[PDB]
Design a protein around this ligand. Structure first.
Ligand SMILES: Nc1nc2c(ncn2[C@@H]2O[C@H](COP(=O)(O)OP(=O)(O)O)[C@@H](O)[C@H]2O)c(=O)[nH]1
Length: 327
C-alpha cells in the first residue's frame, strides 16, 4: 500500500535482534484449514501453490490428465443416474443409446480415459435438454461443482494432445485421506498450511450448500464447536464464506428460507449473504474477547483468493506475530 499499518506493527518486533543472523531468520505462521467436505479447502491449498510457489509444471499437469477424465466421467454419470431417480426423460429419445453407451464405455475401462467415441457420447448427452433440466435440479442429488466446468470444455479436453491447464488441475477433485500439509512464503512469512494450537484457522463454508439433513446447519455446528473451543482462544478465527459465485447464481431462483425458515429479508445476494454471515458469527460466545474475520470468497478465482489472502495476512501480522517463532 502506502503507509501500511501491518508493516508498521511488524517493524516493532525486536526478537530478531536476539539471534545472530536474525534478519535472515524465518518467521513461521501455522494455518489450520477446516470445514465440511466440498467447502473448498483443497482448492485454497492449490491456489497457494499457484499464486505463491511454482504452480504446476507441464509434467505435473500431464499426471492430472486421467483425473480430469475421471472427474468428467463421474459428473455426467451422476447426472444421467439422477434422471432415473427424478423421472426425467431425455429431450431426444435417441440419447438413451448414448446413455447406455456411456455405461458400456466406463464399465470396460479401469481408469479415466478419453476417446472421440466417448467425447461424442458425452457432448450429445450434455447438450440434451432433458439432461440439462436434470443438471439444473442438482440440489436434489449429489453433483460435484466442477461438473459444468469440464463438460462445457469437452472439445478442448478431448483433443488428442490435451495437457491440462492450471485451472484444470485446480478444478480437479482428488481423494486425500489424512492430513495435507503445504509450505509457502508470502510477505516474508513462512506459512505451514494444514488441511478433512496454532496461529490461525481458516474455516471454509460452501455458501451454495444452503438449498441442498441441512448441510449449512452441519457447517454451523462444526464452526460453533471450533470457534468456541478453548484450544483456540488465542487463535485468529478466519471465516471463508466460499462459492460466492455459485451462491450469487442460486439465490436468483432459490430462496434462503429453504435453509433458514425464519428468514424474512429479500432473496438477493446482498441480503441473503449478510444473513448467513450473521448466523455464523453469532455462534461466537466470546464476542467481547474474540473477533471473527469473515471474507466472501471464490476459491477457484485466483484474483479473489490473492486479494483475500492478502487481507488475511495483514490481520495475522497486526495481531499474531508475537506468537510466531523464528527458525
Ligand atoms: N464455482 C466454485 N467452485 C468451487 C469454489 N471453491 C471450490 N470449488 C469447487 O468445489 C469442489 C470442492 O472443493 P474442494 O477444494 O475439493 O473441497 P474440500 O473437500 O473442502 O477440499 C471442487 O470441484 C472445486 O473446484 C468456488 O468458490 N466456486
Amino acid at each position: 500500500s502506502a503507509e501500511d499499518k501491518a508493516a508498521v506493527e511488524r517493524s516493532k518486533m525486536i526478537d530478531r535482534n536476539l539471534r545472530e543472523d536474525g534478519e535472515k531468520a524465518a518467521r513461521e505462521v501455522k494455518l489450520l484449514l477446516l470445514g465440511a467436505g466440498e467447502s473448498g479447502k483443497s482448492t485454497i491449498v492449490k491456489q497457494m501453490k499457484i499464486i505463491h510457489e511454482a504452480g504446476y509444471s507441464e509434467e505435473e499437469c500431464k499426471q492430472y490428465k486421467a483425473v480430469v477424465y475421471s472427474n468428467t466421467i463421474q459428473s455426467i454419470i451422476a447426472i444421467i443416474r439422477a434422471m432415473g431417480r427424478l423421472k426425467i426423460d431425455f429431450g431426444d429419445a435417441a440419447r438413451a443409446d448414448d446413455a447406455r453407451q456411456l455405461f458400456v464405455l466406463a464399465g470396460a475401462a479401469e481408469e479415466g480415459f478419453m476417446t472421440a467415441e466417448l467425447a461424442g457420447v458425452i457432448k450429445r448427452l450434455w447438450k440434451d435438454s432433458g439432461v440439462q433440466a436434470c443438471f439444473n435440479r442438482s440440489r436434489e442429488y449429489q453433483l460435484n461443482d466442477s461438473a459444468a466446468y469440464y463438460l462445457n470444455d469437452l472439445d478442448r479436453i478431448a483433443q488428442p494432445n490435451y495437457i491440462p491447464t492450471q485451472q484444470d488441475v485446480l478444478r480437479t477433485r482428488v481423494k486425500t485421506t489424512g492430513i495435507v500439509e503445504t509450505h509457502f512464503t508470502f510477505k516474508d512469512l513462512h506459512f505451514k498450511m494444514f488441511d478433512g494450537g496454532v496461529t490461525a484457522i481458516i474455516f471454509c463454508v460452501a455458501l451454495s450448500d444452503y438449498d441442498l439433513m441441512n448441510r449449512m446447519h452441519e457447517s454451523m455446528k462444526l464452526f460453533d464447536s471450533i470457534c468456541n473451543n478453548k484450544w483456540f482462544t488465542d487463535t485468529s478465527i478466519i471465516l471463508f464464506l466460499n462459492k460466492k459465485d455459485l451462491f450469487e447464481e442460486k439465490i436468483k431462483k432459490s430462496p434462503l428460507t429453504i435453509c433458514y425458515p425464519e428468514y424474512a429479508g429479500s432473496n438477493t445476494y446482498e441480503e441473503a449473504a449478510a444473513y448467513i454471515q450473521c448466523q455464523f458469527e453469532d455462534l461466537n460466545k466470546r464476542k467481547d474477547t474474540k473477533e471473527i474475520y469473515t471474507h466472501f470468497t471464490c476459491a477457484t478465482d485466483a484474483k479473489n483468493v490473492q486479494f483475500v489472502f492478502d487481507a488475511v495476512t495483514d490481520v495475522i501480522i497486526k495481531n499474531n506475530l508475537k506468537d510466531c517463532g523464528l527458525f
